[PDB]
């Protein structure tokens, strides 16, 4: 069902993550981690303190799709296991966020054409820079459009809230 998902998304904040390649999203899906440039790191750390859930919605550039979404489980930290990102240069990144995936399935942009983001001039939600915040209602409806991921159990994520 969709009820535990709606509970996790209640009063959440949402951010668009744009990856240059599929390899980095595959690493994030396998290891449960993301890293971003310091300007976005600071925004995500502020958001993590401010909201019950902070949701990252991932899209690989030129793919025409979103590849899934995940919830921050920590602020960023330094000095863990090093991550061999494909950088498009590793010293330029900030710390590492731990994330819990909520959906690892794809959603094509053609299915989100009716959703506009007020925080980006009401452009279609697919449009945005890496780190663009997505307003609550747009972000909630976007996450509810993804196919259900029946491999994930949100019981443990609810306990982290």
> Measured between alpha carbons, how far is 46 from 133 in angstroms, rounded to an integer?
12
Q: After which residues is the chain broken (C to N over 2.5 A)?
A: 88
Instruction: Give φ, ψ of 87 to 5 degrees.
Output: -95, 140
Give the resolution in Å: 1.5
Give the number of other CB atoms < 10 A from CB of residue 41: 20
Q: What does DSSP assign to residue 80?
A: S
Give the number of other CB atoms < 10 A from CB of residue 82: 8
Asked whether residue 19 is marked as a ligand-binding residue, the answer is yes
Sheet architecture: strand order including 13-19: 33-35, 96-103, 68-72, 54-60, 13-19, 133-134
DSSP, collapsed to helix, strand or coil, labels residue 160 as: helix
CA angle 120, 97, 51 (to 5 degrees): 55
Determined by: X-ray
Place domain 1-161 in its CATH homologous superfamily. ph1033 like domains (3.10.590.10)
> Measured between alpha carbons, how far is 57 from 135 in angstroms, rounded to an integer?
13
Asked whether residue 130 is marked as a ligand-binding residue, the answer is yes
**Between the CA of residue 97 and those of 15, 88, 112, 150, what are the distances in Å?**
14, 20, 27, 24
Asked whether residue 119 is marked as a ligand-binding residue, the answer is no
Asked whether residue 101 is marked as a ligand-binding residue, the answer is no
CA angle 25, 30, 33 (to 5 degrees): 70
> Measured between alpha carbons, how far is 4 from 100 in angstroms, rounded to an integer?
15
Whether residue 8 contacts residue 47, with contact meaning beta carbons closer than 8 Å, is answered with no
Residues paired with residue 133 on neighbouring β-strands, in sequence order: 15
Asked whether residue 24 is marked as a ligand-binding residue, the answer is no
DSSP letter string over 140-159?
HHHHHHSPP-TT--THHHHH
């Amino acid at each position: 069902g969709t009820s535990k998902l709606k509970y996790v998304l209640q009063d959440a904040r949402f951010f668009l993550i744009k990856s240059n390649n599929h390899e980095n999203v595959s690493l994030a899906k396998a290891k449960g981690v993301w890293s971003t440039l310091p300007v976005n790191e600071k925004k995500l750390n502020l958001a993590f303190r401010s909201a019950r859930s902070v949701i990252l919605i991932f899209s690989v550039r030129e793919s025409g799709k979103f590849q899934g979404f995940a919830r921050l489980s920590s602020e960023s930290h330094h000095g863990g296991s090093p991550i061999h990102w494909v950088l498009p240069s590793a010293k330029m990144l900030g710390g590492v966020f731990k994330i819990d995936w909520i959906c690892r399935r794809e959603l094509p942009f053609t299915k989100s054409a009716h959703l506009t983001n007020p925080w980006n001039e009401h452009k279609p939600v697919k449009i945005g820079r890496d780190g663009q915040e997505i307003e609550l209602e747009c972000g909630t409806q976007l996450c509810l459009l993804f196919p259900p991921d029946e491999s994930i159990d949100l019981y443990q994520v609810i306990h982290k809230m």
